[PDB]
Design a protein around this nucleic acid. Structure first.
Lengths: 184, 258, 187
RNA sequence: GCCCGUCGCUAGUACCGAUUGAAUGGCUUAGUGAGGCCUCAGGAUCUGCGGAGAAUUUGGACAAACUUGGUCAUUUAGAGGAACUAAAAGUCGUAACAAGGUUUCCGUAGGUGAACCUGCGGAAGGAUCAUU
RNA sequence: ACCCACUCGGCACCUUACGAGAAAUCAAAGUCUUUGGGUUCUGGGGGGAGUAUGGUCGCAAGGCUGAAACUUAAAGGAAUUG
RNA sequence: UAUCUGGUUGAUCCUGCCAGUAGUCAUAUGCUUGUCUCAAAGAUUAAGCCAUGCAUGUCUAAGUAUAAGCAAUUUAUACAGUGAAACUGCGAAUGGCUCAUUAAAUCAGUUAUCGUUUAUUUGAUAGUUCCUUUACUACAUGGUAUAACUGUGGUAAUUCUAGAGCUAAUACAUGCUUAAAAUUGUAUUUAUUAGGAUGAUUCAUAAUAACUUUUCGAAUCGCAUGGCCUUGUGCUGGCGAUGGUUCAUUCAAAUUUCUGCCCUAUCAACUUUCGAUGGUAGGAUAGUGGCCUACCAUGGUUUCAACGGGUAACGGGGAAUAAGGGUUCGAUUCCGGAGAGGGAGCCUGAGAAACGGCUACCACAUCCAAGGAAGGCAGCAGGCGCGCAAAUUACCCAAUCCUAAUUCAGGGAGGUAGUGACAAUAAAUAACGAUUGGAAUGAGUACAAUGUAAAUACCUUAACGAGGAACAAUUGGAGGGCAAGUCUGGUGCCAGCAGCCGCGGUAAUUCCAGCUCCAAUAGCGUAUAUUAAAGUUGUUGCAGUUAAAAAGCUCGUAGUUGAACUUUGGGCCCGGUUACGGGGCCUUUUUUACUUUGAAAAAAUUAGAGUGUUCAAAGCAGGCGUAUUGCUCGAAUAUAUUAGCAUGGAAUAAUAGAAUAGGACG
RNA sequence: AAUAUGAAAA
RNA sequence: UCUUAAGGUAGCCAAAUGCCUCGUCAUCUAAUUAGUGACGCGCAUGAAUGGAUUAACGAGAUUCCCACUGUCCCUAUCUAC
């Protein structure tokens, strides 16, 4: 038959599931970033742990080692392109120094909120998932859309979205029709 | 398995064919021909996926049947003809002309040539015998047999064969200095010059090959193909001229030509 | 069918091998031809690859070569007299390889007389000159000297009648002829 | 305080157990031995001194399969017998833990409703590190 | 035969504890998470059980090898205070 | 991301296990269930049984067509186009499924064929076909059938077919046109002779004497019909297809070298009657070979674990989980095996021990009009049975390929759809305002288009489609590990809960309910197995006085281990890197183990590079244009242990040397 | 010199 | 508690010894008062008035099985005297 379709898990649930400090910290993160489930923080922490394992295995290698240079520059380049890392902290040890807050802050939810198109982070997620926010010039409804370093400048309302200057949605149309019928 | 196998699956296909792993169960199994099932490029993969001329196998078959396509000097109509290493494929209706050749990554390149060079091809003479009636003959890597060769032509040399008629235009010997094409092994596609051979008894022979940038490597003699003089190839080589720079160097070149 | 595989024979360490696969055609054997003498009867057996093998039986005559002379003549077969493998083949007159056989002597005798102009036991000018050039060729050894008087020649069968269909052979001579004669007369 | 064993009830597990016990599978001696194949023949019929050739048929090799024994492996019934385990409050004693009221334990042998008792030798894990 | 000193080899002993150990205690039970001088045997919670069985030795008593089903959350070791 | 925690006690320190915790492309099951992508799926027990219907057929210009077929000789009087039926040639030996049998067997890496067969493809290759040696030959070219058909029929019945009359071949059985150049083809076999390549050959090839029941060396087909005249149905002449011997090539096949496999001594000796190890010879093979046979010697394996037994054992690539070591699993998408209910035999064919091919027996099982006949779903669906355990008797050749005479036909191979909480990706169940309101949206419909073979869904989108009793999120839990109730009602060691410790006997933070709260959340729990934790399997890295454990003691073979010593130190330079490492010289100058480097080690998988599939799982796509021109980056990179191959070194550890000197030189 | 036993949970 | 000199111990059994008895259970068979293995409050087993077991042996007694057959179903024929 057909060659198997490879797949992988994007998170890893933690051992000792029941640490009070861990629960409080993750609920703090969820409350102040609008995350729907602990699965989102688990995925973010798993990506962080994977890139940190890669960074540690990279730092273990001797300096100017060809593999070390290639993989390190690739990793920091993708980190700065995503925007989780910053240009000034271009060294490799800052990858280790990274925290989950950077990845949670480079999300489309919080970036929409920072840009100011939303009243709250939850309002931002609602707007994102109702196909109202559009990166570049295309509608996207991914709250976890990792915005590139050249996309926050072009984050704005969708051309099709009623808040983006298009036809004023459905509820507004219904109420306008009702008002016109009453006034007729 | 109580007979010959007449099927090939995508995973079992050679990697340099570059078939995707998810479009279809099977791979185009090459029919019998001048070259082995591996290290050979079928015309269906040379048209549908290499040149993108036809979108489906049926359209590849239509192209083949209307006789636009001829490998070497003869027209080919089978859907999966095993065009090998130095085979010249014409496509006269579009006036292009390619010669198959390995890029430095280790895959069949799409290197185009002119007709003034397509009028010939080279072949690494793989065996020399005396056929019937005492007549000597040579057989090259594409099964092609030429009778009455020059007595100086021995195994591991290269013979230039005119596509109009099988005849020895000239030959290139196997000795130190000759530019060679590494066709086989980890150095698939690499090009360099020979400094010396090893010539072990019984075991596989070894040759030490250094290139223009003085990157010495070693390869079995069964995977080399001498193609011309010292820095004077008898054929036109694809882009890169058979030099493999490191991964970092490739990335730098890509970003500089971005 | 007779199986040629070693999967049925006991292992070198006495281990009874287990039945792995059913018998296969590419390892099949066939019964011996057991070629007798008289009234040639060769049956054609098809063999793998579409080839043909001549399973001979009851062969009449064979081509026998006198290696010292270099010539070979068709000759009728008197019969086997000694077989290195089995005496049953000798007893039942079976034609197989390396069989020591008696054959007719007249063709070789006539060839010798017409090529060297001599005789065993007991005319043109070109013929006399040819015999003078080939002089001292009647020095043929005493074995065959008395052989031709006996009228039958001892020859070793060098073909495989069960394979090629022919019973070609070569005349015993010298040391090997003496050895085989000694084996015959060992009593 | 703790605790031991016999006995009494209930339940479960396994073992021995007459039954020349019973099944399933593997290998195999021996007997019978289909079948196609090779071969010695037989030559209906058809065809131009010949050729092809069906039924049948001689021997040989391959050898299914059946039967009787042999062996190995995996399960499994069985009257009855003797154990073990478990389960809040059953009977008989008090054997051990204190010098447990005869110090205990080990081996061995005998005795006995039951723990256990006694003989011989050994140990202190003894109740003595000690009599110039 | 003594005395004194020294030495080799023994049964040991006294004091410490560098060190070890859970502790009782240990010149070995030390040179062990700073983990490797050589090697033999043995154990994997308590039972069931050194039982059944199959071997094997024994005149016998029994010895050597020696399970499994099943059952249980303790069994045990050393010290403390009562 | 090299971590633990609750439980023996009045309390302590240990051994020690129980229990908790987390993962599982690991299964089942319970409850609950909106969306997108992706997708496993009758393996476990029964390789158990199977109703039914499909899965292998196939033609061009180019084998045979007077179908009493179609359409026409507007090209033609032998035919001319198409074309059912049928002969002919190929294929049906591929694919698909399953994992029963298999423990040096398969299989993996690595070797060999100087040890052989090989349809097809590719490339070469038959003056000797007058050779039986110039009409065997008719060579402007040969012979007979026989299919297809009409008619007569038998049988209840089958993909049964008999008798009669027709007729072709690239079907069968024959047979020339080859002059003649030299010195008589090729094919088979025998014996003799010479002998460009390999590390090496009796190799390749060539020359002799022949043998052969005799192979092959074109009586085939479609197009184009052209040049020469001494103009004749004359002589020459193109493009092909098909066929053909030998050699090579390719697709392969069969054997083959070394190394490597789980548990078992409550399997220690096994093989060897009648094959066991080996030799000689012959048959047999496609070929080597005790593969088989005859004669002969008595050998071969084994405590470095043979032989035997079990395997809930197809092997591997790989999967889960892991600081390092490792443990467990691998029926299953790829490779190689083996099977078609068991077992054997065999035809055809290059290729089969073939089962969607036959033959027989066994076991099943079907229709009979009671004489007969026909089968193997471990293919596709599907049914029964077995079970804890696994989907529709659907559509299509549109992709990927495959086959055939072959662009066109066929393909339950394959794809699409249906079932599908196996698993993975993303992510709705609500946001804002003022102290009750507007604004948005997707679920769910649906004109339309895209999508597709046609469709369903997805992407888009007219219109419809939120205000709660709505469009309502569950699964487990609240004494501790393990955060979360010292709240209420009911029960009263009963019901019951409880992974463990334990709770409950009229004041239950523990049972059944309510409220509240908590963890995870379209998922959660339960059971089993396995991994980490486990330094409780301990090579790294356990313990043995008392916790379990040092055999009663000693001897001793196998095994493991085993005192030191043999070349050092020193000068002079060269060339690398920023002293650090190499090299050369002078100073009197036999086998291994090991170890560096390299070749070689299928993909898929793993790590990883690039790339906004709307992100992500994924995938290997894509990107940039003046977009009517078009151009262009890619699809890397590393492993790979053991085993084998070459190679640098001579420390470490074995191994022999010259002691009744037959010892070196010379 | 005789002295045996004291239920189940907490 | 009565009583004896002691109160059948080890063992074994419906045994050739068990009246009731064709004891009860199992196995053997279609069916078994038979056979065998068990159970033993044994009228009335039992220790050199020897107990139990026992390889081999037996013109001893008994049960079953295979082979075998005119023992029988069911009789018939032949020969000698």
């Amino acid at each position: 038959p057909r060659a198997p379709r490879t797949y992988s898990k994007t998170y890893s649930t933690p051992k000792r599931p029941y640490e009070s400090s861990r629960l409080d910290a993750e609920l703090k993160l969820a409350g102040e970033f609008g995350l729907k489930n602990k699965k989102e923080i688990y995925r973010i922490s798993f990506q962080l742990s994977k890139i940190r394992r890669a960074a540690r295995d990279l730092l273990t290698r001797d300096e100017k080692d060809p593999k070390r240079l290639f993989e390190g520059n690739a990793l920091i380049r993708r980190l700065v392109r995503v925007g989780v890392l910053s240009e000034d902290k271009k060294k490799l040890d800052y990858v280790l120094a990274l925290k989950v807050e950077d990845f949670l802050e480079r999300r489309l939810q919080t970036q929409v909120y920072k840009l100011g198109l939303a009243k709250s982070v939850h309002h931002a997620r609602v707007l994102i998932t109702q196909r109202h926010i559009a990166v570049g010039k295309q509608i996207v409804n991914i709250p976890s859309f990792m915005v590139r370093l050249d996309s926050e400048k072009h984050i704005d309302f969708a051309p099709t979205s009623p808040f983006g200057g298009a036809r004023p949605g459905r509820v507004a149309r219904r109420n306008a029709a009702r008002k016109a019928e009453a006034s007729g | 398995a109580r007979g010959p196998k007449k099927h090939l699956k995508r995973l079992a296909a050679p990697h340099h064919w570059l078939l995707d792993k998810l479009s279809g169960c099977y791979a185009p199994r090459p029919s019998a021909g001048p070259h082995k099932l591996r290290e050979s490029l079928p015309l269906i993969v040379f048209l549908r996926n290499r040149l993108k001329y036809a979108l489906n196998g049926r359209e590849v078959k239509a192209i083949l049947m209307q006789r636009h396509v001829k490998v070497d000097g003869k027209v080919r109509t089978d859907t999966t003809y095993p065009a090998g290493f130095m085979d010249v494929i014409t496509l006269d209706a579009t006036n292009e002309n390619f010669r198959l050749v390995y890029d430095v990554k280790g895959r069949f390149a799409v290197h185009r040539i002119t007709d003034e060079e397509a009028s010939y091809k080279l072949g690494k003479v793989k065996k020399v015998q005396l056929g019937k009636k005492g007549v000597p003959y040579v057989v090259t890597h594409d099964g092609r047999t030429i009778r009455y060769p020059d007595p100086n032509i021995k195994v591991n040399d290269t013979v230039k064969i005119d596509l109009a008629s099988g005849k020895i235009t000239d030959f290139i010997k196997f000795d130190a200095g000759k530019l060679v094409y590494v066709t086989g092994g980890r150095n698939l596609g690499r090009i360099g010059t020979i400094v010396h051979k090893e010539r072990h008894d019984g075991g596989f022979d070894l040759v030490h090959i250094k290139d223009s940038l003085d990157n010495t490597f070693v390869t079995r003699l069964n995977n080399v193909f001498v193609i011309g003089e010292q820095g004077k190839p008898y054929i036109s080589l694809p882009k890169g001229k058979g030099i493999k720079l490191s991964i970092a160097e490739e990335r730098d070149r890509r970003r500089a030509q971005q | 069918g007779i199986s040629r595989d070693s999967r049925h024979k006991r292992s070198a360490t006495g281990a009874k091998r287990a039945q792995f696969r059913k018998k296969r055609k590419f390892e099949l054997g066939r019964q011996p031809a057991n070629t007798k003498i008289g009234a040639k009867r060769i049956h054609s057996v098809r063999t793998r690859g579409g080839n043909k093998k001549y399973r001979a039986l009851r062969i009449e005559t064979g081509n026998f070569s006198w290696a010292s002379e270099g010539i070979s003549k068709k000759t009728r077969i008197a019969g086997v007299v000694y077989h290195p493998s089995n005496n049953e083949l000798v007893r039942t007159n079976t034609l197989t390889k390396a069989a020591i056989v008696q054959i007719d002597a007249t063709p070789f005798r006539q060839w010798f007389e017409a090529h060297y102009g001599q005789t065993l036991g007991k005319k043109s000018k070109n013929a006399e000159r040819k015999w003078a050039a080939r002089a001292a060729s009647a020095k043929i050894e005493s074995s065959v000297e008395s052989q031709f008087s006996a009228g039958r020649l001892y020859a070793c069968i060098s073909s495989r009648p069960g394979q090629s269909g022919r019973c070609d052979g070569y005349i015993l001579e010298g040391e090997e002829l003496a050895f085989y004669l000694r084996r015959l007369t060992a009593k």
